[PDB]
């Protein structure tokens, strides 16, 4: 489809790899008794492998010539969830962390010896500050417009 790739629900190397893995597991399964705990563990492993392959096929990925899925970070609308959808999420969480830390530092800048508050964290003020990062984009944008983000 894109860059000479094959849809993952149509390629044959995917099925061949699945068969190889299943046979490799079943070779070890035969050794033990069918009712024994290792048999149950190996059956669970086989079920997990089958579910993973089915999910990968149903999710609309694209295997390559050799048989493995390929990620597309290009920006096509059919792969929103491949890179772009997770990435934004990360930024959100990441921003949270940063924002919170910055706030805490300012919250201890007033006192005469902030080093004691840096090496021994206090829990009440930190817990007050932690949940303010849930709306970090709005506060950050307002501070940028006001001009309090950058020192002078």
């Amino acid at each position: 489809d894109i860059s000479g790739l094959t849809p993952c629900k149509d390629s044959k190397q995917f099925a061949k790899r699945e068969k190889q893995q299943i046979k490799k597991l079943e070779s070890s399964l035969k050794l033990y008794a069918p009712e024994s705990a290792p048999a149950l563990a190996l059956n669970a492993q086989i079920e997990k492998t089958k579910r993973r392959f089915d999910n990968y096929g149903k999710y609309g990925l694209l295997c390559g010539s050799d048989g493995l899925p390929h990620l597309i970070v290009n920006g096509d609308q059919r792969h929103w969830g491949e890179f772009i959808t997770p990435g934004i999420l990360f930024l959100y969480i990441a921003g949270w962390i940063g924002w919170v830390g910055r706030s805490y530092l300012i919250a201890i800048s007033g006192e005469k010896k902030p080093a004691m508050k840096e090496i021994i964290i206090d829990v009440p003020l930190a817990s007050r500050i932690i949940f303010r990062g849930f709306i970090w984009p709005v506060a950050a944008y307002r501070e940028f417009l006001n001009g309090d983000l950058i020192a002078k």
């Binding site: 024994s36 705990a37 290792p38 149950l40 563990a41 669970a44």
Partner: peptide, 11 residues
């Protein structure tokens, strides 16, 4: 020996 191995996979 089977029970010892199963102790890890109880859940």
């Amino acid at each position: 020996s089977g029970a010892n191995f199963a102790r890890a996979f109880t859940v």
